[PDB]
Write a protein that holds these residues in place. Structure first.
Motif, PDB file in Angstrom:
ATOM      1  N   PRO A 199     -16.479  -1.446  12.919  1.00 18.98           N
ATOM      2  CA  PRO A 199     -16.100  -0.045  13.113  1.00 18.98           C
ATOM      3  C   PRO A 199     -15.893   0.314  14.579  1.00 18.98           C
ATOM      4  N   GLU A 200     -14.925  -0.322  15.219  1.00 25.47           N
ATOM      5  CA  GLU A 200     -14.602  -0.014  16.597  1.00 25.47           C
ATOM      6  C   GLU A 200     -13.383   0.888  16.622  1.00 25.47           C
ATOM      7  N   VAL A 201     -12.314   0.406  16.006  1.00 26.35           N
ATOM      8  CA  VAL A 201     -11.115   1.194  15.818  1.00 26.35           C
ATOM      9  C   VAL A 201     -10.796   1.328  14.331  1.00 26.35           C
ATOM     10  N   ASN A 202     -10.589   2.560  13.910  1.00 26.73           N
ATOM     11  CA  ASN A 202     -10.189   2.862  12.542  1.00 26.73           C
ATOM     12  C   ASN A 202      -8.805   2.279  12.246  1.00 26.73           C
ATOM     13  N   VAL A 203      -8.739   1.389  11.262  1.00 27.54           N
ATOM     14  CA  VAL A 203      -7.478   0.762  10.873  1.00 27.54           C
ATOM     15  C   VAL A 203      -6.879   1.455   9.667  1.00 27.54           C
ATOM     16  N   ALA A 204      -7.483   2.555   9.240  1.00 31.83           N
ATOM     17  CA  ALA A 204      -6.966   3.289   8.100  1.00 31.83           C
ATOM     18  C   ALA A 204      -5.760   4.122   8.488  1.00 31.83           C
ATOM     19  N   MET A 205      -4.612   3.483   8.466  1.00 34.42           N
ATOM     20  CA  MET A 205      -3.353   4.161   8.619  1.00 34.42           C
ATOM     21  C   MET A 205      -2.798   4.337   7.225  1.00 34.42           C
ATOM     22  N   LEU A 206      -2.964   5.525   6.696  1.00 31.48           N
ATOM     23  CA  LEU A 206      -2.870   5.714   5.268  1.00 31.48           C
ATOM     24  C   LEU A 206      -1.436   5.945   4.834  1.00 31.48           C
ATOM     25  N   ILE A 207      -0.966   5.076   3.941  1.00 30.70           N
ATOM     26  CA  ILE A 207       0.351   5.223   3.342  1.00 30.70           C
ATOM     27  C   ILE A 207       0.356   6.501   2.516  1.00 30.70           C
ATOM     28  N   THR A 208      -0.829   6.836   2.022  1.00 30.20           N
ATOM     29  CA  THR A 208      -1.077   8.089   1.334  1.00 30.20           C
ATOM     30  C   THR A 208      -2.217   8.817   2.050  1.00 30.20           C
ATOM     31  N   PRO A 209      -1.888   9.566   3.117  1.00 33.48           N
ATOM     32  CA  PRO A 209      -2.881  10.135   4.030  1.00 33.48           C
ATOM     33  C   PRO A 209      -3.454  11.472   3.579  1.00 33.48           C
ATOM     34  N   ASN A 210      -3.468  11.684   2.282  1.00 29.02           N
ATOM     35  CA  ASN A 210      -4.044  12.891   1.696  1.00 29.02           C
ATOM     36  C   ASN A 210      -4.619  12.610   0.312  1.00 29.02           C
ATOM     37  N   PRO A 211      -5.687  11.795   0.232  1.00 30.31           N
ATOM     38  CA  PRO A 211      -6.334  11.489  -1.035  1.00 30.31           C
ATOM     39  C   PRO A 211      -7.300  12.574  -1.476  1.00 30.31           C
TER      40      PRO A 211
ATOM     41  N   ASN B 160      -8.352  -5.870   7.806  1.00 31.36           N
ATOM     42  CA  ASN B 160      -8.710  -4.486   7.581  1.00 31.36           C
ATOM     43  C   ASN B 160      -9.855  -4.448   6.573  1.00 31.36           C
ATOM     44  N   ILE B 161     -10.488  -3.304   6.449  1.00 30.02           N
ATOM     45  CA  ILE B 161     -11.449  -3.052   5.380  1.00 30.02           C
ATOM     46  C   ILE B 161     -11.615  -1.568   5.234  1.00 30.02           C
ATOM     47  N   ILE B 162     -11.706  -1.093   4.015  1.00 31.73           N
ATOM     48  CA  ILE B 162     -11.760   0.338   3.814  1.00 31.73           C
ATOM     49  C   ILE B 162     -13.196   0.765   3.597  1.00 31.73           C
ATOM     50  N   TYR B 163     -13.626   1.706   4.415  1.00 30.07           N
ATOM     51  CA  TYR B 163     -14.903   2.356   4.253  1.00 30.07           C
ATOM     52  C   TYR B 163     -14.670   3.711   3.608  1.00 30.07           C
ATOM     53  N   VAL B 164     -14.741   3.751   2.292  1.00 32.23           N
ATOM     54  CA  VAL B 164     -14.556   4.995   1.571  1.00 32.23           C
ATOM     55  C   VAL B 164     -15.888   5.709   1.537  1.00 32.23           C
TER      56      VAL B 164
END
Length: 93
Positions: free
Chosen positions: A48-60, A79-83
């Protein structure tokens, strides 16, 4: 409680998976919170240094069946998603 949903309320329905169109999807299920603001982020290779969540759907949003499907990505790499409290690593390729 439609709002910023509490990080621990969803469940791993489907962990970060390459969507198919050359991006990533993840699927999460709610326990009760209705149309919420899903805190879906991603960290580079379990770091968790830089957020790689560049969301193709950026409004879940989480609905009557849960968040459902979301779309994330970051230039090919780890990448890894921290939901919220959820997480799952996977180099997207």
């Amino acid at each position: 409680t439609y709002t910023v949903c509490d990080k621990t309320k969803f469940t791993w329905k489907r962990a970060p998976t390459d969507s198919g169109h050359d991006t990533v999807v993840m699927e999460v299920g709610f326990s009760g919170t209705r149309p919420c603001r899903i805190p879906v982020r991603a960290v580079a290779h379990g770091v968790p240094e830089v957020n790689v969540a560049m969301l193709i759907t950026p409004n879940p949003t989480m609905e009557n069946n849960g968040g459902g499907f979301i779309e994330m990505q970051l230039p090919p790499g780890d990448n890894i998603i921290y939901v919220g409290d959820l997480n799952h690593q996977w180099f997207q390729k």
